[PDB]
Symmetry: C2
Subunit: 166 residues, 2 copies
């Protein structure tokens, strides 16, 4: 499901994280990377590489912090996946959430419809696989942490999603 | 289920097809367009437009002949959809099948894994929706019509699919 781009396909470094999420997960936190935007499979694969590079080598993390990344190419990029706890929303929310991050800065841009489609489809695939609860709740990154993420315009959109709860 | 680029998004001309398929459909016929390939959302949306233009304007069909198109950008493009009979495999197979076409020429190229993923994912959602049978069968275009489509290399791959039946 999701036609998710797997780790090796975007040339990811090997994970070394061990902490597992306890399925089914009840929460989904939507962020933005506040990094560069990308609109092709080649450029978004490079961008997921860059995001992981910063988390791995500079911040010293066991892997890219997000469970999944959404490109403006309309594709979902595998981060830590469904079963591995992320590092994207702080110690309160990391073990009870799935963190999906839109690659870009969305204070003054909206992501394209195909990016939003990929995100909602990804969440449906998480329900189908048992990784998410049927009644999962979507939160903005700014609703759980002091941050402008996921950006004003993207935040406006996710507030209209049927599973969003402030 | 599934993420599909809708007709209006790739700026399709309005369909005038009326004849319906009978759910659930038993057969899926995999073609290639034998035309240009594309690996970005912008270029693949244009390519779906070009394919439809040739079918509608030159061949005089009611819409693009394919039920769905697959781009090398990794996205699925809505053709006639799940419920409308296509024009892709001749009068014997058109009324009993779903026609999916990889946009490109795959005599000497393989489609990228993300294109293959998009096609397999699309068929799974067809089953989930009830548009396809649980036990649908995948055929190559050359298995039902005299043609090189879907191309030697693509044909080699679909023969390895679990629902393939020569
Ligand atoms: Cl970490």
């Amino acid at each position: 499901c999701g036609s998710i781009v797997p780790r090796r396909e975007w040339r990811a470094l090997a994970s070394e994280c061990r902490e597992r999420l306890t399925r089914p997960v009840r929460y989904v936190v939507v962020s933005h990377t506040a990094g560069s935007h990308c609109d092709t499979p080649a450029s978004c694969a490079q961008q997921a590489q860059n995001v992981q590079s910063y988390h791995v080598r500079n911040l010293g993390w066991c892997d890219v912090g997000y469970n999944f990344l959404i490109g403006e190419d309309g594709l979902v990029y595998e981060g830590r996946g469904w079963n591995i706890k992320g590092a994207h929303a702080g110690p309160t929310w990391n073990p009870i959430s799935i963190g999906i991050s839109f690659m870009g800065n969305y204070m003054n841009r909206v992501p394209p419809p195909r990016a939003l489609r990929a995100a909602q489809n990804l969440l449906a695939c998480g329900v189908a696989l048992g990784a998410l609860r049927s009644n999962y709740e979507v939160k903005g990154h700014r609703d759980v942490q002091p941050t402008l993420s996921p950006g004003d315009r993207l935040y406006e959109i996710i507030q209209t999603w049927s599973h969003y709860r402030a």
